[PDB]
Amino acid sequence: EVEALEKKVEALEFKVQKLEKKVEALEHGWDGR
Amino acid sequence: EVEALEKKVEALEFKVQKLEKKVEALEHGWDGR
Amino acid sequence: EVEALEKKVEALEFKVQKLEKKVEALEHGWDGR
């Protein structure tokens, strides 16, 4: 159960990082995004 | 403690999904968003 | 392991909240964002 929770948390960390990058690009207009 | 952690993780998964949908709409201008 | 998982989850909660605020601002054009 715990190891599956860690795997869920690791996946959330990657998704959250992807979202931060996308939001920063929208906020700053990087490369016309 | 663990069951509460799972419940926290399940809630984060739903929020992260909501954020992905909103960010994709901003990125692609869907329906004028 | 569990206490470290909680600490990871607490950090994800803060990041997710930051992302919600930023996305809401982009969506609504608050203060010209």
Measured in angstroms, the resolution is 2.2
Q: Give the CA dihedral A27, B12, B15, C32, nearest 10 degrees.
A: -30
Q: Give the tokens for residue A4.
A: 């599956």
Q: Give the tokens for residue B22.
A: 């909103």
**Most C CBs within 10 Å, among A1, A3, A12, A15, to test the C interface:** A12
CB A22 within 8 A of CB B23: yes
Whole-angstrom distance, CA of residue B23 vs CA of residue A24: 11
Whole-angstrom distance, CA of residue C19 vs CA of residue C32: 17
How far, CA to CA in Å, does B11 sit from each of A29, B2, C5, C29, C30? 30, 14, 15, 27, 27
Q: Which of B21, C7, B27 is nearest to A13 (CA)?
A: C7
Q: Give the tokens for residue B1.
A: 């403690």
Burial of residue A13 (CB within 10 Å: 0-12, 13-18, 19+) is middle
- Kindly report the length of chain A: 33
Chains in contact with A via at least 3 Cβ–Cβ pairs below 8 Å: B, C
Q: What angle do CA B1, B4, B8 make, to 5 degrees?
A: 135
Select from B5, B15, B26 the Cβ nearest to the Cβ of C16.
B15
Q: What angle do CA C5, B23, A25 make, to 5 degrees?
A: 90
